[PDB]
Amino acid sequence: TEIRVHQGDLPNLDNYRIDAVAVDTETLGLQPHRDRLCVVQLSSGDGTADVIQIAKGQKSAPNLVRLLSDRDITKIFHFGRFDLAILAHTFGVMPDVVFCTKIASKLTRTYTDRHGLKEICGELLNVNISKQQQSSDWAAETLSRAQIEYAASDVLYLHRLKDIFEERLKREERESVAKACFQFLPMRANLDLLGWSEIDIFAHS
Amino acid sequence: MTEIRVHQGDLPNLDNYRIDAVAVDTETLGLQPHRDRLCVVQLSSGDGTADVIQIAKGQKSAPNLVRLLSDRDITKIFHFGRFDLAILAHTFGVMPDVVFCTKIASKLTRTYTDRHGLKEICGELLNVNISKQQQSSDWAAETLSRAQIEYAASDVLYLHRLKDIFEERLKREERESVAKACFQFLPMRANLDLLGWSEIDIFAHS
Amino acid sequence: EIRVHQGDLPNLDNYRIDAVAVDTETLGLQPHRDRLCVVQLSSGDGTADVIQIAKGQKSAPNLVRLLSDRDITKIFHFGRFDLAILAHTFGVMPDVVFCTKIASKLTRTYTDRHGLKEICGELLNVNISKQQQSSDWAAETLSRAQIEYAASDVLYLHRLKDIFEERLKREERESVAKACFQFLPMRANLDLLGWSEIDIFAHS
Amino acid sequence: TEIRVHQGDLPNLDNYRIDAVAVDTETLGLQPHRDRLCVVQLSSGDGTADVIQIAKGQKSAPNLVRLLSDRDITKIFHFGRFDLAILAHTFGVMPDVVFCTKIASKLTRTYTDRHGLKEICGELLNVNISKQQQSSDWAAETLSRAQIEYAASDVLYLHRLKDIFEERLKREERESVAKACFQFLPMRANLDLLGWSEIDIFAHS
Amino acid sequence: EIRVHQGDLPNLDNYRIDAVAVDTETLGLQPHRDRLCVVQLSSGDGTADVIQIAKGQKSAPNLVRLLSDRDITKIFHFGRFDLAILAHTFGVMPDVVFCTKIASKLTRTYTDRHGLKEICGELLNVNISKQQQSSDWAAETLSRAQIEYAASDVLYLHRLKDIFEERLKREERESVAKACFQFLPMRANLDLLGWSEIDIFAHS
Amino acid sequence: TEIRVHQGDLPNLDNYRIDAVAVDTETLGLQPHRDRLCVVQLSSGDGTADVIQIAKGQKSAPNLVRLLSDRDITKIFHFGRFDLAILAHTFGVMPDVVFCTKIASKLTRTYTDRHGLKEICGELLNVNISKQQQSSDWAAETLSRAQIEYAASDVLYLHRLKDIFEERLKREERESVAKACFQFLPMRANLDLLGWSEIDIFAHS
Amino acid sequence: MTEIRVHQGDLPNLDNYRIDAVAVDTETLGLQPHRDRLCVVQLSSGDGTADVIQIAKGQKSAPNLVRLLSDRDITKIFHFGRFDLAILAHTFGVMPDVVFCTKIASKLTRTYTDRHGLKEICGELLNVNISKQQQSSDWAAETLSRAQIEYAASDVLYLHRLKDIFEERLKREERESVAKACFQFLPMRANLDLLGWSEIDIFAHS
Amino acid sequence: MTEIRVHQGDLPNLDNYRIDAVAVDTETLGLQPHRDRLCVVQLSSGDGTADVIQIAKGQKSAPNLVRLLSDRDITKIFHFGRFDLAILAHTFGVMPDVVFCTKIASKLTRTYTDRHGLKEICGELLNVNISKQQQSSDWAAETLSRAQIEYAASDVLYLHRLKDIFEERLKREERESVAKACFQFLPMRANLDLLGWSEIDIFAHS
């Protein structure tokens, strides 16, 4: 599996002249105001991935941010609620053309309450995600090989997952539902950054 | 005393509703729209009067009411519009797409409390006392009691005033775009409820 | 008025009727530990019979005839309990029953409060005072407060049943309610047999 | 051994001139108004099973429904509360002669709180049920062999379980209790469909 | 009338009796942290003695005589606590006790409310006011409200014990209650030794 | 491992001319008024055991009851609260000379909250209790070899556990505490039968 | 009758605070300092008078108030200083480091209760009734109501008296050094909150 | 292959502990210091060897150990020193005041996890397997088993290495002063436990 490791940014957009890009991040934790962005992962869906180490205090990443702001390119996430928050917090740009495989799973895999990436990859693709490195020092100057393979695996399969979920959403006639959820997702991420992360804004109480 | 006009089935006309925004509430036989039928629709133009419309069992249309609901030039003001939107679309087939919800607005602005119900908000923002005693009553009754009628009217008589104050706070705290986005999703949150996700926060990790 | 009896009704002169309201008072909620102390009856006419049951009493032929008579519907509020302590004490389980709590749950769909006090207040504007519910129901002489409270448990069940029957018809749930009432005695039996903490129909 | 797979309906009832039939279903989830019926499984208890795929929007299946309506044939379920709801919701017919092994288990296996099909088959028959395919896309146009074999395993043993539970119900003198529970079960399923699925209708509060 | 003492009773002239009502006040529920502040006594005659216990006070010989006197039953409400703090402070564990809280749990089977205020209200129509329960019981001079409150904890235990004895006999639970009172000093010891959060008889 | 299996009662007391006997029971469940006594197990501590099947409706077991009544013989249980209740409920005699290894564990193994028999046997004796048959039909006319061996394991080690616990109670100076707990245990079992099984009679609330 | 001096932005001078200890409290738009701005700072010298300082949105300095908060010769008295210290440090950039907290003091002396709120403490120790009606109010309002102003003043008018009593109790129970150590750590506990550990007991095993 | 020196009562001398920091753990009869006596004290210099000291019932002194514990020129490294500081001070009358706690350090650096136990941290940072089987055993045994001895030694063999990594991370994330204030309060937090606040977060609002 070809995994290209970069410092700071993509060197160019040559591998991403595409309509959709799979995106994930690694951080020091779940709290974007405390836990810095450490890694950004990308794949075009061709079976290879880019792993971008983000430095402490890094304010800019122009090639990555070009993709994030390109409205001709759908940003595919698994649980984009988190990735959108830390990406917009770090580089100042919120994507507004997105697809989330966790939301799509909640709308289509109605026979389960297990919507994690590992569960979804195994059921839909018979692909085994190993989570051992999720709890690791993502701020390390040199990521280990196990870390780099794990980070790549978070984006290697999102295109294939999106294709299946799009088929399920059509079959169950839920495309307009999903579209509305993906349209609000960036604001749900902004709500988290502004201080409503523990609040379901739509709940009665 | 408040002028309350009680109607059977529909408004007789829209002469009182050539306006920019209308306050709306419903009463039902309970919280489950597939089991508990729409019983009452309440409306107010914001002038201190209200219309109380009794909806019959099995009633499939309400042309004048549905006209307002579909009018993109009229903002429908709800308190917890998530519920009213679901039952209204379920009963008459039309989902409003221009809304303001004082419950969402409260959660975005009254950040110093966890109490976001209508009674609490009217008391704090307007010194108005809402009595909830009739909230649990037979809303399907053929003749509503005066207490039911006055309580149903009270749910819509203050929403314009609440919306004015919440708009001031949204602007003061720079949250107008957040609120607009939430209102834009609210009809789809209501449809999610009707489709079978009423117990699921669709944006949660688990 | 309220007629107080020891042991049994003297006769059935006041119960040549098609439906009778029934409630019980006990020393607590556990029939195998907490004996039956009182049985209250009403014909619906605004009078009640309050029957004190002795410790160790195993028979009351006039009361039990009513409980056994399939031509008389026994009206309860939460008959699940009364059916159990009555069957446990006298050995007979009534099988023609109406329960206002089940009726409430099937019709007052806008609330989770289905107790007798809430129901009497909402449907009849009648105030039930629960202060004597926690009292020594086994006292040889009941206080006037206990007697009037015990009577109030049965004075309004005919009127509640009439309104609930109207609502069950309106919402087209009559056959559902009938099936629930039909199972209620077996639900009471399940309680006496050891399943009182188990919803027998739940997945877990 | 033999699993016969059908589309739409049984071709006939040649294999079901019997006095009791084992029945299970598969759906897109637990919510009958949202999650459509996808598969109906049947067994005569002879070690063979019929697995019938149900199409989206299909509201009839005359051979199956004749069995379900036949008052001379007991329908054996495990947790019939669910199957009765989705069958009645889909086909318009509510079976009224039933046996449920889950209810039987709660009335006889008084030394445990584990009343699932897997646990009962292990204990009473030394038969292993694998539940890996319980969470799968039962709406698939073509089921996998693992799905088909799992679905069959839900009905292959219900006759044998019913025979043991009947022995136990007799031994502990609970036959009338079980019969009354089975008699109310179709109405408990109806209550679920009408909106009381989260309410123990017999509870005090 | 309430007699307020410093340190100890002056004599036992009021306590040549078969049973004495006892309660305590402390700085809190933890005996190893929260010192004994007050000890209250009543002979049952409608008067009380309120004894302020000083910080570091190691003895109270007249009080300890009553506590050690095998011919005098010590009546407590929730003796489990009083026995612990008394034994920890003065070194003596009473072994002849009656506890109205245990007695209530064994007889008032129609409720889960077994506090002293609830029991006095139901059995005696006596109103206990708990306002001073949270107050500085180590104060050098207790307020009148504190004093009256501390006395109210012992003024009615004789009358309660009499009713509870009647109920225990009626329901045939005397030997059960006696066994519970027999173990209560060791339950208190278990608390002092480090098991205050453990039901020693529970399966888990 | 020698296990003698009896119907109804011991044939005689020749193996139990001893100062202490280990006792356990098997039933159809945890509820003595619903779940009948099925098995009584006994051991003298010599590495052998007696397994006594109790018939439905059996009201008498004179040899077993002579031991339960013999004040010169300590009855050793693990969690005797249960065995005392079902034994007194079934045959009418409450033992009053008892040692409980669970209570002893709670008073000595202060470094853990795991006081089950399997945990204690592993830690104190390096003996492996297998609980697979705990959930089984103990009313069966013919018990399986696995059932009989498991039932025997419940009594084969209680003497050795008692000796160790007695040493620890002495070392930590808690002998009089344990003695009072054992003295009250028959009444705790009685309280259970009378209707307080869910109530800690000594709790503030 | 209680004299309350209301200021915009800052104290005009320190003439009323040439003292050894100052009572301090704050009002905000809520409990989350990164979202909910500092709206009011209240001060009292213990003399029965109070100063109520309205803080503007985006205000970053208040040099006279901040001098008080930085002056190591002046103990700042708080009730639940954990919160005030965090919002004050977040807003003005200075963390006070000589503090007394009546809530910590209460937890170490009122061992017979789990109710350690200011209302509860004032009633028991002083027979003073604190009314909490305005706690949930719009503290960012341009003009505070008389009710809000009197409530804000009441948070500081009694803290000197509470501190005296708690100091007596801490000496009596021989816990002065414990309290001192808790106070010394309190600014770091507040800093931990601002840094992202507000929901974590940093000293707990799990 | 691991040199573990076992002693009764005390170290025989301090020849192996002329060092700047010593790793310490304890074993007891349980988590309650007033009921559950000190049974073992373990030490390591960080050199791959350990000392395991059995403490007798009722023993109140251990002069060589206590000299180390009192030496302000030597940092005592603990994992969850809150517990060890309590039982050591309770048993020997001396409260160490120069300390490092790897559990607190983990909570301040391993921000991506709620698993801060010694086994999880050893596995993650060092790829070292801690086997907890003997944690539930009779530590008051007159003769400890080889398994008990090896387990006890494993609690202290790696704390120097953990300390060095956590120090790197505290520097990197700029939290050194935070950690230092936490370590500074930790002896008083242990004292609070001994005095009766072991179930109370003294800094919490409620």
Numbering used by the authors:
A (entry chain E), D (entry chain A), F (entry chain G): 2 to 206
B (entry chain M), G (entry chain I), H (entry chain C): 1 to 206
C (entry chain K), E (entry chain O): 3 to 206
Q: Which statements did the authors publish about this structure?
A:
Orn and NrnC are 3′–5′ exonucleases with a DnaQ fold containing the catalytic DEDD motif, a domain that is common in enzymes that act on nucleic acids. Notably, Orn (and its eukaryotic ortholog REXO2) or NrnC activity is critical for cellular growth, rendering them unique amongst the exoribonucleases known to date. Through quantitative structure-function analyses, we show here that NrnC-type RNases share this narrow substrate length preference with Orn. The structures confirm an octameric assembly as a conserved feature of NrnC-type RNases.
Similar binding poses to pGG at NrnC were observed with pAA and pGC, suggesting that most if not all diribonucleotides can be accommodated by NrnC.
